[PDB]
């Protein structure tokens, strides 16, 4: 016989980071976290490969 395994994990972002997130050098508006979510997205994509 044979039986598979299950692998899941979560990742959250609270209000204070999703509202207050600019950069360091520039006076950039608060829409930076919508670019930073894609990094954790492709990181979970690359982390399911490592199992």
Partner 1 sequence: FPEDSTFASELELYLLRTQDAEQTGMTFVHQVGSTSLPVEARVAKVDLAKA
**Residue ranges in contact with partner 1 by CB under 8 A:** 19-20, 22, 27-31
Give the shortest CB-30-to-partner 1 separation in angstroms: 6
Q: Judge whether 19 and 29 are in contact, CB under 8 Å.
A: no
Give the shortest CB-39-to-partner 1 separation in angstroms: 22
Alpha-carbon distance 46 to 40, whole Å? 10
In terms of CB distance, is 10 or 29 closer to partner 1?
Answer: 29
| Three-point CA angle 42, 38, 19, nearest 5° | 145
In terms of CB distance, is 9 or 26 closer to partner 1?
Answer: 26
């Amino acid at each position: 016989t044979w039986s598979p395994l299950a692998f899941k994990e979560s990742r959250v972002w609270d209000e204070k980071e999703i509202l207050y997130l600019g950069r360091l050098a520039d006076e950039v508006q608060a829409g930076v976290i919508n670019e930073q979510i894609a990094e954790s997205l492709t990181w979970l994509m690359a982390r399911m490969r490592n199992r």
